[model samples]
Target: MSDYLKVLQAIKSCPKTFQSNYVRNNASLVAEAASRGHISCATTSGRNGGAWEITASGTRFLKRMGGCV
Candidate 1:
């Protein structure tokens, strides 16, 4: 498993769309984030990974934890 902030940071790093696997080869990371409305994805997070983008909610979440405020 990977840290949630790290995963959200990874998506923020791109500021646009990024591959889920690019973070840590673990797609489920952002997928969970997506489920929580932190981010949106082009496809379901799975073995084949897809494009992902951070959302305002995601930034807020990071800010709440002092990770991206």
Candidate 2:
């Protein structure tokens, strides 16, 4: 699978926030995905400051990669 797809699958669980730095530190691929519009992100009021979520396009992309199961 592509790096972007890997990041999308990694964040399949919602309401589960992740810090930008965390992805950047651990998987820069996630950041790359975000930049490519394969993933979505939002700012949170919590300590995490920011979190990522899979977009509709991301879902479709994953489905093409075998349904994210």
Candidate 3:
């Protein structure tokens, strides 16, 4: 996970609630990621933001890309 994958991995690694800043701050990166079905959020605006949870498809993509081994 370098750029795009980095955010996805961040959420997957932290698995917290509305973990913004590093995760959601990078709008373009996150936007690209979410567009790929690799991640999702409950809400885009609020006090903080939505939790960037990696979807099943996201996990699958990680594995598929993780084949970097």
Candidate 4:
């Protein structure tokens, strides 16, 4: 529970923290949130690796104590 919130915080603090691997574990929750306009997707791909970040709505959702994550 707390770990997921941490994930959200990390997403806000360092958007890259909520990248591909993180989403892989919490895809359903993230997807649902994204679908509902509570989260947006930002993807990056390069020689180093690939990544993604949650959007403004995601931060608000976290602030509102959305338990789905």
TM-score of each: 0.47, 0.44, 0.54, 0.45
Q: Number of backbone collisions per candidate, in order? A: 0, 0, 0, 0
Which candidate, 2 or 3, would have the higher lDDT against the true structure? 3
In candidate 3, stretches whose alpha carbon ends up further than 4 angstroms from where it belongs are: 14-19, 63-69
Cα deviation at 25, candidate 4, in Å, is 2.8
Q: All predictions: root-mean-square deviation over Cα? A: 4.6, 4.8, 4.0, 4.5
Best by lDDT: 3
Off by over 4 Å in 4: 1-9, 14-20, 43-52, 66-69
Query: Per-residue alpha-carbon lDDT of model 4 for 15-63, expressed as tens digits?
Result: 5564446765665545555434554444534312433456665666564
Each prediction's Cα lDDT score?
0.53, 0.52, 0.55, 0.51
Taking the tens digit of each residue's C-alpha lDDT, what string does model 1 give over 2-37?
A: 355556565556642234555336556656675555
Candidate 1 to truth, TM:
0.47
Q: Clash pairs of candidate 1?
A: none
**Candidate 2 lDDT, 1-69, residue by residue in tens:** 354455555545543423343554445646666555676666533325455556666656554664324
